[PDB]
Design a protein around this nucleic acid. Structure first.
Lengths: 98, 93, 109, 59, 80, 74, 73
DNA sequence: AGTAATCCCCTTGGCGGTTAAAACGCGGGGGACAGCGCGTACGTGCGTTTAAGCGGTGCTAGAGCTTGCTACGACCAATTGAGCGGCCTCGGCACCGGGATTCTCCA
DNA sequence: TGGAGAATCCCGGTGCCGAGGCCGCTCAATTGGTCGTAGCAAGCTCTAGCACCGCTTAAACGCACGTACGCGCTGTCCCCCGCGTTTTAACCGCCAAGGGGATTACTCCC
């Protein structure tokens, strides 16, 4: 019989890994193309500096990481361990984005 | 010819921690920080002069700006450091 | 024509009173810029730079590092109550986050 | 305006396609059709309807 | 094109781990993609507005930093 | 909504911690009150969502604390 | 001298402010929590409104000093 | 003084591979969610009293405005060295491997 | 309680690339004098801020008491996690291109 960590044990081992680290968590090339796509809707035949899409990635990831914290607190405010779309929707309405 | 705070940040680093280095990306944070807080203070000092109907950014404008923009103990320590720097610039030239 | 001694040296500062005077003029913050206002500001910029780098040099030392990294700036800035209030809407590139797990998520007996 | 024209003359001295290139051509079409407003927003898949219609339009 | 689907499920998981989240409903992933692009569509239109008003046909790191700073999310490290 | 005189006295009482024997223009107190009522009303809106989200119709101190924590007031 | 005037925002006043925020029912522990909220707010407004008053070397706080303090929130 | 060729540079696009990260399948567990009972804690109504609100009287602090000038900053020309761009190197930090210690889970 | 084994740590070794210091020079900060003016100071005006009294009644409080709702409990089931397998596309490197912006030539026009 194989050894098996219980459900939620490696979710904790992962929190202690992505916290306590600095790396960017979205793959670089996919983020560039999404940025170029969104740019086309505003002005075609733009160009981007490497440091411009980096600055824009860093700001996005920090926005999503900071958002998830607020939904984790919404989930945990209900009796839940599980975040759900209604937690994002609450967090953003309390923040005033929504 | 660009301009940077790196030389002045190093000369503060080698005072507080004469043993300690700083990486270029970390020095980048220090430039952004000095730029951002210089601009935040000057922005309030501007508004304070404007509100008063005064043409002049004095040290009194920058004192009141510092007491608006900083938390209570950072405010007092900064007000102390600022008031002695001006006092030693006075009694010189 | 006497031997020049910098406004910083006369004020007793490492930060440049000359640049702070120019930039208060070039930015057009107000019509007139006092002689001492660049000194007061250059002193506060120097002071807050010491606060950051003191706490960050401690954090670098805690990590057994000789050299400050944006990680150590983030740790210092978020651990200190007043820096955290001064920078409570600032994102630091490659800072990461504070290690913080809600107590309810920790495993059962 | 010879500062323009001497080159524009010299262009046709060399070859008329430099001045305005000859291309696949047809009679004047005296009719309505729906023209494309944006090339960018058309995408890769598009339906070509038959829009060709007379401008003489008996009501 | 839909490179929004290039923001994969593992990536949205990793971001939630750094946010300290233990358990994630499978409905979260499409909600998170919808939230991400609404963020980008605000920052890029401002970064474009700066390059447009400053009359350049390339987007620089400082265009983004002004865009972010005006949106309210001051970024240190890329100029700024 | 808040009674005016006990709000004046609350304003004076707070102000004395910063400068003794200040004076307040009558319009300055109303501008403080109208901002405080608008602040409390706007926070109770956000707590009511926190209760309703936790399936509770009754607002509770942890609903104030969640609202403020997400608004970044804490 | 003045003391304890934060108990001047009565519990009915806190009811009115909560009902206008759409609240149906109010836990009895809200009433002291609301005061810890109102006071922490009203202090750091008045801190600036007075700072704008001792700058410009005056002694009445004006509505404009309040407005500049709120504008700093 | 204009317009076009020439040439630098730096950004976008394509090709190959390699491998590390994303997608897919499947068992089971345990966490989400509906259901139940109780009980205590909040909304309601009444009688009580408390002081907020209004109309009115009195005073003086100090906000607001004008007058007068001189101290302080704007402006310019000549001087110089503090600060930036370019080149170098060596030592700090990462990256690996391997054995030692820790933690987790079923027994 | 033990144990097995996986996962996290540590210790020393390797190397590479970026941090810290040196060099040349420019040009931006400083020295010196000028001149205008604004805001510092002294002085008058009267606004409006603070204090007190007396009355009115609506707003605040303490209490009775019912029942609506917060909370711990029980059961289930479904769906999200931990792990092995399959596969695809992110990453890297190298070459192309084109474009655009600055420069240089040559003529016509003034």
């Amino acid at each position: 019989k194989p050894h098996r960590y219980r459900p939620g044990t490696v979710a904790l081992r992962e929190i202690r890994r992505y916290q306590k680290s600095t790396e960017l968590l979205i793959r670089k090339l996919p983020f560039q193309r999404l940025v170029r796509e969104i740019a086309q809707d505003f002005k075609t035949d733009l160009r981007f500096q490497s440091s411009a899409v980096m600055a824009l990635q860093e700001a996005c990831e920090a926005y999503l990481v900071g958002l998830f914290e607020d939904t984790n607190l919404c989930a945990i405010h209900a009796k839940r361990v599980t975040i759900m779309p209604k937690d994002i929707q609450l967090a953003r309405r309390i923040r005033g984005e929504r | 010819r660009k301009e940077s705070y790196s030389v002045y940040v190093y000369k503060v680093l080698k005072q507080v921690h004469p043993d300690t280095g700083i990486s270029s990306k970390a020095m980048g944070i220090m430039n952004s920080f000095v730029n951002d807080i210089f601009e935040r203070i000057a922005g309030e000092a501007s508004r304070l002069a404007h509100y008063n109907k005064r043409s002049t950014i004095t040290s009194r404008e920058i004192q009141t700006a510092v007491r608006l923009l900083l938390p209570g103990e950072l405010a007092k320590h900064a007000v102390s450091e600022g008031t002695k720097a001006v006092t030693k610039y006075t009694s010189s030239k | 024509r006497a031997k020049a001694k910098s406004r910083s040296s006369r004020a007793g500062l490492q930060f440049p009173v000359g640049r702070v005077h120019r930039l208060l003029r070039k930015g057009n913050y107000a019509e007139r810029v006092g002689a001492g206002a660049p000194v007061y500001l250059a002193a506060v910029l120097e002071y807050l730079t010491a606060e950051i780098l003191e706490l960050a040099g401690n954090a670098a030392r805690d990590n057994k590092k000789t050299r400050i990294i944006p990680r150590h700036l983030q740790l210092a800035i978020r651990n200190d109550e007043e820096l955290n209030k001064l920078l409570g809407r600032v994102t630091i590139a490659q800072g990461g986050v504070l290690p913080n797990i809600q107590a309810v998520l920790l495993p059962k007996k | 305006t010879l500062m323009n024209l001497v080159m524009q003359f010299r262009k046709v001295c060399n070859h008329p396609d430099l001045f305005e290139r000859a291309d696949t051509s047809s009679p004047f079409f005296c009719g309505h059709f729906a023209e494309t407003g944006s090339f960018l927003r058309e995408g890769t898949n598009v339906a070509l309807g038959y829009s060709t219609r007379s401008l003489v339009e008996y009501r | 094109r839909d490179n929004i689907q290039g923001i994969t499920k593992p990536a949205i998981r990793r971001l939630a781990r750094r946010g300290g989240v233990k358990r994630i409903s499978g409905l979260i992933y499409e909600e998170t993609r919808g939230v991400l692009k609404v963020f980008l569509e605000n920052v890029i239109r401002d970064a474009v507005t700066y390059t447009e008003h400053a009359k350049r046909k390339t987007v620089t790191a400082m265009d983004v930093v002004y865009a972010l700073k005006r949106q309210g999310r001051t970024l240190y490290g890329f100029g700024g």
